[PDB]
Design an enzyme around this catalytic site. Structure first.
Site, PDB file in Angstrom:
ATOM      1  N   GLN A   1     -27.076   6.654  45.304  1.00  0.00           N
ATOM      2  CA  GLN A   1     -28.172   6.151  44.479  1.00  0.00           C
ATOM      3  C   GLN A   1     -29.456   6.627  45.142  1.00  0.00           C
ATOM      4  O   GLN A   1     -29.948   5.997  46.083  1.00  0.00           O
ATOM      5  CB  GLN A   1     -28.086   4.628  44.357  1.00  0.00           C
ATOM      6  CG  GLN A   1     -26.739   4.162  43.773  1.00  0.00           C
ATOM      7  CD  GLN A   1     -26.677   4.302  42.259  1.00  0.00           C
ATOM      8  OE1 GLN A   1     -27.439   3.657  41.538  1.00  0.00           O
ATOM      9  NE2 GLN A   1     -25.779   5.152  41.774  1.00  0.00           N
TER      10      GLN A   1
ATOM     11  N   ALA B   1     -30.728  -4.695  37.992  1.00  0.00           N
ATOM     12  CA  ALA B   1     -29.828  -3.577  38.277  1.00  0.00           C
ATOM     13  C   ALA B   1     -30.581  -2.247  38.381  1.00  0.00           C
ATOM     14  O   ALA B   1     -31.771  -2.136  38.073  1.00  0.00           O
ATOM     15  CB  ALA B   1     -28.756  -3.480  37.193  1.00  0.00           C
ATOM     16  N   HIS B   2     -29.849  -1.205  38.774  1.00  0.00           N
ATOM     17  CA  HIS B   2     -30.487   0.102  38.921  1.00  0.00           C
ATOM     18  C   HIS B   2     -31.040   0.585  37.589  1.00  0.00           C
ATOM     19  O   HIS B   2     -30.431   0.396  36.536  1.00  0.00           O
ATOM     20  CB  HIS B   2     -29.520   1.138  39.527  1.00  0.00           C
ATOM     21  CG  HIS B   2     -28.241   1.346  38.766  1.00  0.00           C
ATOM     22  ND1 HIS B   2     -27.307   2.284  39.152  1.00  0.00           N
ATOM     23  CD2 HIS B   2     -27.727   0.739  37.670  1.00  0.00           C
ATOM     24  CE1 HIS B   2     -26.282   2.257  38.317  1.00  0.00           C
ATOM     25  NE2 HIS B   2     -26.511   1.327  37.408  1.00  0.00           N
ATOM     26  N   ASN B   3     -32.225   1.189  37.647  1.00  0.00           N
ATOM     27  CA  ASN B   3     -32.865   1.828  36.504  1.00  0.00           C
ATOM     28  C   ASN B   3     -33.293   0.843  35.433  1.00  0.00           C
ATOM     29  O   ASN B   3     -33.556   1.242  34.298  1.00  0.00           O
ATOM     30  CB  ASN B   3     -31.957   2.904  35.907  1.00  0.00           C
ATOM     31  CG  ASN B   3     -31.703   4.023  36.888  1.00  0.00           C
ATOM     32  OD1 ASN B   3     -30.660   4.070  37.544  1.00  0.00           O
ATOM     33  ND2 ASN B   3     -32.696   4.890  37.053  1.00  0.00           N
TER      34      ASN B   3
END
Ligand SMILES: CC1(C)CC(=O)c2c(nc3nn(-c4ccccc4)c(O)c3c2-c2cccs2)C1
Ligand SMILES: CC1(C)CC(=O)c2c(nc3nn(-c4ccccc4)c(O)c3c2-c2cccs2)C1
Ligand SMILES: CC1(C)CC(=O)c2c(nc3nn(-c4ccccc4)c(O)c3c2-c2cccs2)C1
Ligand SMILES: [Mg+2]
Ligand SMILES: [Mg+2]
Lengths: 335, 337, 339
Positions: free
Chosen positions: B196, B237-239
């Site tokens: 990531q 969460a991511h993004n």
């Protein structure tokens, strides 16, 4: 940096373009610049591949006609992306060498090339395998063992008598081995049950941030090999999770639950205890799991969002559904 | 710090009624206020009760003034005035003062003016800390991360590498910013880690509660807009992208690549699916199960709330068998017609 | 740690049947128990299985005794006896011993007798630690906070300023006590922070799990009563009040200004809204969605459980359109009623 030809070889991809192109990193399709390799999975991005400015694009064969740059053809672009991102990974290590501010008990047993970050605390009897990395500010409690290649980011708490396998990764804020929620009751007063079981974590387990995994009461809480667990999860005492299962963010599990292999537990699900889920079960997000699951497949629960005006009526009707049922039965009786 | 009532009134843009020389030492609730304390009244039902309040002064409206039994500060908005006067008289300590000898600070870190770093905090290479930044005890700030002027971290906050945090933010203890997103590819049943390598960008004047986790992006970034407030135990969460001024209450769990608009209000314990968008000016009430995009502003809700267990058993069993109930209704309709 | 069986039996008020000279070294499950271990049987279906258990002694009832294949301790309550003997034979280490040289302790802190403070813990000015208090490694205890005698914090616990903790409490790692409540005014769409200058007051004999957060009050206090047990991943908002002996299971979220009475049991993953009261002796089953006050004791529940996805899709569709089902039912009733 790596030559496109050498990258394609390591990726078992077949190259369509200048193998001497130098790739310096991975980027999304929209952000890719010269030197970047990217990928595409969805066919909608075909029509404007000429707008992508990556040096190379990982794609399938059906995609190749639309290519407007060097291309690596593979069967599974997403898995190739995973592998090439590992090759080109820019992620730093939690620590390098042993920091002078780390506090390490003289009876700790350390392998070779162990790194321990500033102000980490290592208790008596701890075993750290070769190439283990402990991040800044971690705590590792008495007699716990961490297998070779495993890494903890900063501010991880491992309690005592915990066993962690090889090549694991644990993100910050996570706590492994706290007391399970065990109490007897003496005339309304709670009586603590010491939790003298352990946590056993297998190989290649990844655990997210601010997740808690409690130790067992007598026997052990067990996380199988290859399991991945997201952030904010709670794994109660004596839970057993089979190999390769995935647990998404914010899942709460009750004590003595057993989950099989190759399961997928969706975000914010709630799984009750003293029951078993068989192999190859998918619970979709926010699932309310009250009963054992004995057949593989996908399971779901919940009444989804509605505009508030509509929800008010839906909820009031549902709460009075017994009266609706009685009225239907009466109407059947009359007809 | 003690302040004369007249001076406090001037700083609050309030109209003073009473003795400006009264010395105010702090803010208190109406029921707890004692001599030296200032308090406020937002509910005119308490007019008849003001004689039972022992505060040296009470913030109130012009309509309330005839009912005062103390020096009064008359304002248009007592609640906002309360927030402002509590800031002026805030007793909250700073997370740290000066740079602690036990802090571990890489030689390449760049410290601005008047930076404080608490005991046993750890600051990696390349970190940049703006003027007046305060890092609490035991924090970790990862390689090359940047924290803007006036931002403060309480004790035991974890910031990973390559994180950007704006000016005048506040982050409570136990929070983790920039851990790996939950990114994995599947190979014959085995999970293959996706590094990531995106970041987290946090804007200006953002407040994040305790034990919240905001993951870094896979390639592009997780983004928190300016003026956002996030409560405890949230998962971003991511993004995920969260628009300016949005509020997220405690325990909200968000999936990857969700975009929330500006000026939204997400109620506590809601669950929001990923790879979709919520437009501006949306309110989701508590425990909302948000599974599809929200394209119109307004208020949205879900959930069947509590009943006595005996009643719930029937509600749940009937809902689960509602297809049979629907079929029976149709059959009865055809028989009658 | 080791204890003669006869001595253990006496401390448990159990009736010994077998060799009192047996040396017990620890507690184990029936399945795991070996020589030196004591175990217990709560389920009489395992009587036929006792010959497979290799514990040196088994705690059981008088009714079980004829089935024993080992020294037996006969008691009225095997489960409560197990808890007591597990405490006597506890192998859990302490979070710390003595005062670590790497701890950073303000000169104005006041320590009682036999306090232990772990490596790299940080103790602010004005903190008061009572006799036998143990602070784990990497903890933070903020200004003027007070921790009562015998209370223990595991590693990496955060206590903010002006917090009061009673005697014989236990707080697991990653927990945060006294962070700012979620308090903001609004000035033309801009959030304006409300300083949270109330406190958290925790009573005696409180146990709090890992990664739980308990916010300080806005002006007055967040209050946790005596003998309360709180599991992991719980959220207790500013100005919540929890009555004595209440239990809160894992992942429960409580909104601001909730009051919960005594002897309540709040099931895991429940969501309890604020500015309302729950009376004494209420049980909320797991994942309960509490939107209204509870004024009578008893058991309350919510939620529609799991179904196969294809079935759930139909269930959800029908429920979301339940208003139409209701209108059709009423119309059919009028027809059957000849109107
Ligand atoms: C493990 C994986 C590589 C693949 C995967 O299947 C998955 C992933 N991430 C998820 N996030 N959330 C989520 C998070 C927060 C709120 C709501 C949902 C899920 O439900 C997720 C799921 C699952 C879907 C169905 C069962 S598990 C990534
Ligand atoms: C940000 C603000 C100043 C105003 C606000 O909007 C708000 C606040 N505190 C909340 N606590 N909880 C909560 C917490 C835990 C469980 C259940 C509920 C909400 O849902 C909250 C909300 C919201 C309501 C609807 C959408 S956001 C304070
Ligand atoms: C305190 C005690 C000794 C007894 C007890 O009552 C209890 C205990 N552990 C629990 N775990 N979970 C749980 C956790 C995660 C997900 C789902 C459920 C409950 O709901 C639990 C409850 C309760 C049941 C109903 C009300 S409280 C242990
Ligand atoms: Mg140190
Ligand atoms: Mg939750």
């Amino acid at each position: 940096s790596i030559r496109l030809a050498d990258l394609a070889q390591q990726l078992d991809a077949e190259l369509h373009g200048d193998g001497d192109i130098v790739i310096t990193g991975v980027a999304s399709m929209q952000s890719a610049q010269t030197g970047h390799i990217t990928f595409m999975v969805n066919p909608k991005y075909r029509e404007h591949l000429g707008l992508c400015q990556a040096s190379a694009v990982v794609m399938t064969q059906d995609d190749l006609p639309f290519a407007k740059s060097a291309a690596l053809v593979v069967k599974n672009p997403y898995l190739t992306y995973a592998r090439m991102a590992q090759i080109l990974d820019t992620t730093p290590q939690p620590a390098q060498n042993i920091a002078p501010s780390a506090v390490i008990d003289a009876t700790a047993k350390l392998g070779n090339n162990v790194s321990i970050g500033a102000n980490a605390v290592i208790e008596s009897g701890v075993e750290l395998g070769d190439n283990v990395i402990i991040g800044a500010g971690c705590f590792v409690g008495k007699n716990s063992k961490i297998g070779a290649g495993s890494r903890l980011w900063a501010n991880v708490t491992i309690y005592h008598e915990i066993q962690i396998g090889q090549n694991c990764l644990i993100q910050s804020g996570t706590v492994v081995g706290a007391d399970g929620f065990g109490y007897a009751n003496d005339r309304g007063n709670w009586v603590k049950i010491p939790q003298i079981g352990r946590v056993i974590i297998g190989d290649r387990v990844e655990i997210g941030a601010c997740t808690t995994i409690d130790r067992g009461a007598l026997d052990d809480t067990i996380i199988g090999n290859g399991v991945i667990i997201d952030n904010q999860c709670q794994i109660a005492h004596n839970v057993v999770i089979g190999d390769n299962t995935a647990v998404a963010g914010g899942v709460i599990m009750a004590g003595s639950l057993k989950i099989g292999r190759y399961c997928m537990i969706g975000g914010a699900s709630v799984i009750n205890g003293h029951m078993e889920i068989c192999d190859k079960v998918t619970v979709t997000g926010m699932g309310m799991v009250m009963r054992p699951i004995t057949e593989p497949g996908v399971y779901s629960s919940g009444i989804p969002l509605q505009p508030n005006k509509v929800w008010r009526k839906t909820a009031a009707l549902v709460m009075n559904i017994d009266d609706m049922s009685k009225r239907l039965k009466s109407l059947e009786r009359k007809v």
